[PDB]
Amino acid sequence: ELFSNQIIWFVDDTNVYRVTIHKTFEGNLTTKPINGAIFIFNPRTGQLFLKIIHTSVWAGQKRLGQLAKWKTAEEVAALIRSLPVEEQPKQIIVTRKGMLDPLEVHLLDFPNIVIKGSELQLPFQACLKVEKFGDLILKATEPQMVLFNLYDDWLKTISSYTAFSRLILILRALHVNNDRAKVILKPDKTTITEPHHIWPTLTDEEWIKVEVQLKDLILAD
Ligand SMILES: [Cl-]
Ligand SMILES: [Cl-]
Ligand SMILES: [Cl-]
Prior knowledge:
- The protein is of the alpha/beta class.
- The chain has helices at residues 64-82, 100-106, 131-139, 160-176, 178-184, 204-220; strands at 8-12, 18-23, 29-34, 36-41, 47-53, 91-94, 114-117, 144-149.
- The longest helix is centred in the N-terminal third of the chain and has 19 residues, at 64-82.
- It comes from Homo sapiens (Human).
């Protein structure tokens, strides 16, 4: 299913509409949008398209949570139209069921694309506390798209299946317990992440231990 000749994208809209809530000195709640992002992810290659959503897009509107699903569908269609046909996905898997109808309506010109939902736990929200992504999203002054390779150099020595599994454990562990996951991912004082990489440079033996520890952290919930 995943990892064949068919191009597959996971689409996560969870982080598109984001707000800060504050109790004022007068005792009322202010809710202020902050920048968000769409995550569009190819599990075979590790490609991430990060569409940064600047708060200016909300200017005027209400029911921003519902509108955000539609904005996401619009942006997915816009990305697809910007790609040659051979690079367009055959399947889009949405991580949240609320994306199904908006995407259906936005992709009527793409009869080859199959849209489905999922029960998979793929918390791209965890990327918001990976500084590379978090600061980039925070500080943006306009919408833009940024490409990343979420598998770093892993595919030189492991399969796409193994890479996908490693990434999911990382994201879920960061989601469940960011601070402990970050410790697990830094086994030595000298552990570094290369500037163009997302994740640490670890030996095969270190990854084995990390993967078990991340799994145990998720199990502990
Ligand atoms: Cl939903
Ligand atoms: Cl594979
Ligand atoms: Cl999770």
